[PDB]
Every structure is written in structure tokens, then in C-alpha cells.
Amino acid sequence: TMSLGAENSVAYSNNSIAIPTNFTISVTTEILPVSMTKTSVDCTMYICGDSTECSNLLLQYGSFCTQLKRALTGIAVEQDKNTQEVFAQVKQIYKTPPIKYFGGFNFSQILPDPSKPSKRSPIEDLLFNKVTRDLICAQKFKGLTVLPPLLTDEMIAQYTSALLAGTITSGWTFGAGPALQIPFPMQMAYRFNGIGVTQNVLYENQKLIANQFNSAIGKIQDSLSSTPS
Amino acid sequence: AGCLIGAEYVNNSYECDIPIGAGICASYQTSQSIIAYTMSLGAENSVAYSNNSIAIPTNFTISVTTEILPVSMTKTSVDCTMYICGD
Amino acid sequence: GTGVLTESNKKFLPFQQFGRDIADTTDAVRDPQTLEILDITPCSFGGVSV
Amino acid sequence: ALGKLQDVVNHNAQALNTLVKQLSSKFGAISSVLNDIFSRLDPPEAEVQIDRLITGRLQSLQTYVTQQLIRAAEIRASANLAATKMSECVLGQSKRVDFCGKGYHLMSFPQSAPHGVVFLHVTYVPAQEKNFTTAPAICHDGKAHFPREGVFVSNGTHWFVTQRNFYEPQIITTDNTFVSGNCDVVIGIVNNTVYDP
Amino acid sequence: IDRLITGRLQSLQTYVTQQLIRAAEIRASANLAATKMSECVLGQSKRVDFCGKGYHLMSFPQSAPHGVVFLHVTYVPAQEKNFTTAPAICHDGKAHFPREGVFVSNGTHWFVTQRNFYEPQIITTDNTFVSGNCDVVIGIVNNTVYDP
16 A cells, blocks of 8 residues: 655644754755757658659548648747747846856856867756657658757747856846846855845855755766666 | 748748748748748847846836737627528 | 668668668659669659748 | 738638639539529439539538538637736736736736727836956855845955846945855855845 | 548647657646746746755756756755744843744753754844733743843
């Protein structure tokens, strides 16, 4: 019988309170599809196939090859629009500064690596190495063609770099107007005020939180590589 | 994506007007002829990041935008006995 | 069928005459007169967009 | 401008134009007119010919209903989004970025539209920013003073405390700052003086 | 020939039908990704479980094949310790309610700490406001409210 989990009985009293004394910064991952494969079909090749007599009989079913091709065309435009509403949310394409000393936080795994020609971060490199005549050319010979997306993988990597050069060098200012510079140690001081804790919690424990963030972001490369699913 | 015969590839980058594919867009700009180009993602701004530098705005501008959202479609009602069997 | 009849490097067995692809499509064939194994590739097609 | 509203109108029009044109498509029969088949054919054999049309026309009508159910889900998703957006942007002030337009949402006004609704999101966009010198905390009486609600800025010589979204220079007093710890753990703490009221 | 043309035409419509239903599933996930791209990355969100499991601090978008990977930086408390609480305290006849915090006691003394971290501070007249007498609140204790 499937078990729901452990049975923890929280001791409830009229004068009992549990106030935390320490914190553990955790970096969790989230997977969401944004785009689908842009496909297109050919009526003449799929229905009959390398023939002329059958093509004449297909003319009777008139509005049956243009309603399907137009329906798949709307999907192709949809897939090119689902990427603009997600990645293309900022007008100016920001760039990371040369000096990458952000107070003690190491973003080397999420910032783009200029060494490789793809200009992608090590985290993104692991993602493209897991999400995979041949089958691609076989289906082409029947009418099934995979149209290429509008935004290439290189352009999407530039949109992500622009969203990271405004999240580290700035805060919530580049998504609601002009980009306002602000130190990263002072940025998280205001983000801590949103959850309830004051600013002295971050400054008096800056080195501790910096080590926890670097350790949490370092296990993401191992967690995704280890777990195949 | 294919072989574009009828346009010229200019090195300048503009906004995407007619999406072709694989980052290539087309437009009818000026002699008037169809030109092809690589779509530009936007301007290249560089935010100066320093350990003791912050930017505080001094003025503000109230902007009123618009957002169109469909609510309902055309309510249809077909007649099965009339559409299939016409008189 | 229709298509281009080019040479191939697929090593056929003596009793093998025809050859299909993964999607059940004739990709290679053995010539009846000469024991040469060709490569049937479809005629160049595609889709135009104006 | 009003392009999202003309999309659902042209789709319903095209759906009714392709459905009405399928009546002129012989689904393997001798003709497309029912009266011509019934008249120019004997009853036993006319059944075979008339069954090819009723099969195609009933399948073509089913294809229309199938597309209308998928299209209604898109409208229902846009209707639930507009109902949630109007309830959060018009009847309240939402703190969700980009939800009630781009920028700091102040208010919104709904307006009727043919088969839709047009929102007028009144946002707050800052402008005319200036570069200043900042510091996490200050040290006057050997103890660190953190900004309660604001940011410690400096014009080059003096130190002031301003808001996070509007430059309003104010003197650093013991009322807009709180003390926490000594001046040894905070990195980058400047030495300034506070003014006790 | 009318058996294969019709059979292949209906099978092609079956493909388009499933492609339109799966497009709505992708569009729903794309709208959720676009919503989290502006609420988790373009700012801090106070929605629980939305930008990760825990108190959301920051998020970093990462590109992926046919998708996006969000790295949510959350705040997770740990090392919990039990204390003794009280709604308000009574000094000089009036009740003192805390402005932003909670009254805790280590057994003998009373302090005021924030609701997400243990920072013991003395009960002053700057973090507690007076409102009402000491005969309506049930559970009020007696203490000394220091004043600067």
C-alpha cells in the first residue's frame, strides 16, 4: 500500500512558538516546455505518393488539403510567438561586466562562457547534451518536414544573458523601466526585506550566504547529470 | 531554411518585419527592393556595475498602456437536417 | 517508382534483392543484370513560399 | 491595434466559409446535388451513392465542431485571464510585474469592446536617474546603523538617505535607522555621523 | 482507391487534431513560463510555491531545448527552537502590542524577535505600540517596557 509520508505531530500549545535560528539557501530547478516542433505536411506526397492518376481523384476532396495545411501553419506561427513572450521580454540586450566580483557569489556556471564557440553557460551545456538513412530524412520523403524555428539557439542564449546581466547588476528595475545600477550585496538586502527578515541578517552573514549559494548552484550541475529523468 | 531567390542579404540589422526562418527576416526598404537581414534582438546597453554605485531616479513619467483580450466568440447553431439534407 | 539511382555502400546479402528504410520506403535495389546494389533516392522536391 | 479581436472574428468566418464550401465537394458520388441523385437513380442503387455524401458531410460537420471545441478552450483561457486581470488590476493594486502592464501598476480602467475587453493600465515608469555612491551601513557611535526604509546615498561629500524609487535627500537621524551589531562584520561600512533629535 | 485516399485523409486530420490539442498544452505551459519569467526573474514574488518551494528570493533563467529552466533561490529556515510566547504585555496599566515581531521568552526574560529569525532584542517603546487596557486581551503577561 502506497505510503503518504512520515507522521509528524506538531506539538500545539497556547504559549508555544518556534522561531528559526538559522537559514539554508536552496536552489531548486524547474522544467517547463516553451516551444514545440514546427511541422508541415504535403498532401500530394502523403496521400498518393509518386503517382498521377491518384492525384486526379484527390481533386474531388477540395477543401481538405488547404484546411489542414493552414491549421498547421497557425501552430508554426504560435511556436514562434510562444518564444517571444517568454524570452523576449526586455528591449535592451545587456552585457555582463568584465570584473565578475559580485560580493562573493560565483555565477560562473550560469553566465555565458566565452571560451566555447556557442557562448552558453556550463549549466546550459549540460541541458543540450541530454535533450536529444536516418529518421529525420526518412519522414521528409513522405511530406513530413520540420520547419526551423525563428529564433535560433544562439539568439535565445543572448536573451538569457540579457536577463542575467540585469538580474545581477540590477534588480527589479530593468523589468519596470530603465535599468538602475545597484550592488548585488545591497540587492539581496532588499530581497530579504520582502520575506520578512531585516537587512542585518544578510550583511552580518554575507560570507556564509555566499558559500551556501555557491554550494547550492554547484550541485545543480551534478543533480541534473546524475539523475537521468 | 532554404534558398531565398529574390532578395539581397544586407549586413545591417533591423527589426523583424517578415519572418523567414533561422533568424532571417525580410523587409521592403529603400531604389525599392526586398532585402534580407539577420534580426536584431535590441540595443546593446552596458550597465555600469560597481561596489559603491547606485542609481536612484529623480523624476517619473506616468504611462497608460493598452492590452487587448478576447472574451467571447460568435455563438453558432447549425441545422443537421438542413445542412446534410437540403430540401 | 521514381527517383535517382546512385551507387551505395550498403553490403547486401546474396539472397537480398530489395531494400526498405526505417519508414518502410524503398531506399536501395539490386540491378537484375549486373550484381550492383544501387541507392534509390527520391527526386528533388520541396515546398515554395512567396 | 485591435488585431486580437479581428482574429476570432475571421476564424469564425473562415470556419463557416470552409464548411459551406464542402457541400460542393463530391465525396466519391456521381454529383453533389441530392435531388439530382434521388431523381436520376433507382431507390436500391441510389442508397449507395447517397451514403457517400451523408458520410462526408457528417464528417465535415464533425470537423467543424472539433475545431470549435479547441477554439473555445483558447477563448475560455483568455476569458479566465481577463476575469482574473480585471479583478486584480481594476479592483485593486497588483504587485505582479508585467501583469497589469509594464511598470509599477497604479490603477487600471476597463472598457468594452466587440467580443473582448480593452484595459488601460496606468503604470509608473521612473526616469531621469543619477549615479550616486552607496554604502550598506554607517558607523558613528562604534555601532552599525542600517537604513530602515531607504538607501544610504552620497553626493560626493555628504551622506543622505533617500527612497528606493525617488531621490529625496534626507538627513540621517536615529529615527530612520536601526542599530544592529558593531562595526566589524559588515564589509564596506563607511564612517559617518548621525543626528539625534 | 477511395478506401486508401479516405483512410489516409482521415488519418491526416487525426494528426492535425492532436497537434491542436497539444498546442494548447504547450501554450498553457508557455504562458506559465512567461508569467514566471516576469514574476520570478523580473522581480520578487510573494506567491507561495510559485517561484520555487519556499520564500522566494531570486531566480535565474536558463535556456533549454524547447523549454526554459528556472533556478529559484529560496529561503528555507532551519534549526528551530521552541520558546514561550504571549499576545501582549502589560506595563503602567496599558497593553503593549508589538509592531513588527513576536514576543518570545527564554524562561526568565522576555524579548522581541522577528517572525522568521531569532534576533533577541530588548522590549523598548519604539517597537511596541500601546492600544487598550489590560483586561480585554486573553493571555497578556506582566513585564517591564524599557524606554530610552
